[PDB]
Design a protein around this ligand. Structure first.
Ligand SMILES: CCc1[nH]c2nc(Sc3cnc4ncc(=O)[nH]c4c3)nc(N3CC[C@@H](N)C3)c2c1Cl
Length: 361
C-alpha cells in the first residue's frame, strides 16, 4: 500500500499468457471463483454456483455481500466498474502472474462480461465488452435486503485462447478440491453442454482424503489432521502421514483455497514444524544427524491456510510469500503433532525409525 498502481488492460491483452493459462478458459473461471471464495472466507457467503452454457460462456454466482457499487470519489465510477476495467496492484517497494492480479483479467480477455449484483435490496446490472463498460450500471429489479450476491457471466475471446471450450474434467477436479478444504461452502455445477449437475459439500472436510488417495499403509494409520487451527485471523487446515510406497505421492498446498504449485511459506512452515516435533520427540525420549529434509522425504500432505491479504511470488505468482505464515504454521504443527506423538508411542516410534533410516543415506 506504500505504492498503489492502476492501469488499463492493454498489458493483459498483449501478453494473455502472463495473466492466464491460454490452453482454455479454465484459469479465467478459477479467477472468478477465487473472488467468490474470498467472500466465503470473509464469512459472508456459503454458496458458489457455476454454469457452463452451450454458447461456451461461463457464469459464476455467489451469495456474498454483492460487489460494491458506490462511486469512487477519485475515479468517478462505481466500485464494480473500477474493479473490472483496471489492473490494480501495489506493494512496499517497486520490484503479471496467475494469482493476485484480479478479475479485470477475465474482463480483458472476454468479448462480453455481464455482472448482476444484489445489494441493499437492489439488483444492479452492468455490461462490458473487451474490458470496457458498454452498458451503464443500472437498477433493474428489487429484492429483499438480505437477498445478496454477485453473478458474473463471461464469454472468453477466442483471439487469446488455444481452445475456448472449457475442460470439464479439470474444472470438476478444481471444484472438488475447493469444497474439501472449506466445510462452510457448497458448490454447484451445471454443465448445459453435457446435461450434468454436481453438488459438493464436505461436512467432514479433509477426513478420509489421504486414505482414499493412498492406502497403501501409512504412518499414522489414520492420517494426522490439523482441524481449523487459528491464531485469531489466520487459519490452518492440514492432513499428513508418511508412506514408504512412493507410487502415489500427494503434496498439495493452498492459500485461500487457491492451489500453490510453487509452494511457499506455508509449505516451509509445515516442513519446519514437522522437523521440530520429530527432533524434540527423539531428544525427549533417547543418535543420527536427522535433517528437516529427512523428516519431510516420505511425507504426504495437504496444507491449506486462510489469511487476509495473500501475497504471491515468482514470475507466475504460484508461490505464497507472506513471511509471517511460516512461523504461524511451524508452531501449530510442532505443538499439535507433539501432543499426538506423546499419546501414540507405538506409531511414534515407527515414524522416528523410518525417518532415521532416510537420514542413514
Ligand atoms: C462472482 C465473483 C465475485 N463475487 C464477489 N463478491 C464480492 S462481495 C464484497 C462486498 N464488499 C466488499 N467490501 C470490501 C472488500 O474489500 N471486498 C468486498 C467484497 N466482491 C467481489 N469483488 C470485490 C473485490 C474483488 N475481490 C472482487 C466479488 C467477485 Cl469478483
Amino acid at each position: 500500500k506504500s505504492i498503489e498502481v492502476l492501469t488499463g488492460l492493454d498489458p493483459v491483452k498483449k501478453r494473455p499468457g502472463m495473466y492466464t493459462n491460454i490452453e482454455n478458459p479454465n484459469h479465467l473461471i478459477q479467477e472468478i471463483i477465487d473472488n467468490s471464495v474470498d467472500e466465503v472466507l470473509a464469512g459472508f457467503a456459503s454458496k458458489i454456483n457455476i454454469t457452463l452454457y452451450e454458447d461456451n460462456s461461463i457464469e459464476v454466482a455467489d451469495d456474498g455481500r454483492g460487489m460494491p457499487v458506490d462511486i469512487h470519489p477519485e475515479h468517478k465510477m462505481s466500485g464494480i466498474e473500477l474493479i473490472m476495467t483496471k489492473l490494480h496492484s501495489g506493494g512496499k517497494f517497486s520490484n503479471g502472474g496467475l494469482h493476485g492480479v484480479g478479475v479485470s483479467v477475465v474482463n480483458a480477455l472476454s468479448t462480453r462480461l455481464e455482472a448482476e449484483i444484489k445489494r441493499d435490496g437492489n439488483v444492479y446490472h452492468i455490461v462490458f465488452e473487451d474490458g470496457f463498460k458498454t452498458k451503464d450500471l443500472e437498477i433493474i429489479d428489487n429484492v429483499g435486503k438480505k437477498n445478496t450476491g454477485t453473478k458474473i457471466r463471461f464469454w472468453p475471446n477466442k483471439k487469446y485462447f488455444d481452445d475456448i471450450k472449457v475442460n470439464f474434467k479439470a474444472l470438476k477436479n478444481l471444484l472438488e478440491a475447493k469444497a474439501i478444504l472449506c466445510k462452510a461452502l457448497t458448490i454447484k455445477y451445471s454443465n448445459e453442454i453435457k446435461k450434468e449437475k454436481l453438488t459438493w459439500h464436505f461436512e467432514t472436510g479433509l477426513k478420509g482424503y489421504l486414505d482414499h488417495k493412498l492406502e497403501a499403509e501409512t504412518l499414522p494409520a489414520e492420517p494426522f489432521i490439523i482441524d481449523n487451527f487459528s491464531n485469531g485471523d489466520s487459519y490452518l487446515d492440514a492432513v499428513f502421514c508418511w508412506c514408504e510406497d512412493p507410487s502415489e505421492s500427494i503434496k498439495n498446498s493452498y492459500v485461500n483455497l487457491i492451489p500453490t504449485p510453487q509452494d511457499g511459506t506455508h509449505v516451509t512452515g509445515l516442513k519446519n514444524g514437522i522437523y521440530d516435533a520429530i527432533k524434540a520427540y527423539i531428544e525427549k525420549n533417547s543418535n543420527i544427524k536427522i535433517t528437516a529434509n529427512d523428516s519431510f522425504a516420505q511425507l504426504n500432505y495437504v496444507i491449506s491456510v486462510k489469511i487476509t491479504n495473500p501475497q504471491f511470488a515468482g514470475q507466475t505468482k504460484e508461490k505464497l510469500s507472506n513471511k509471517d505464515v511460516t512461523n504461524f504454521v511451524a508452531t501449530a504443527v510442532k505443538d499439535l503433532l507433539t501432543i499426538w506423538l506423546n499419546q501414540n508411542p507405538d506409531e511414534a516410534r515407527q515414524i522416528v525409525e523410518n525417518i532415521s533410516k532416510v537420514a542413514q543415506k
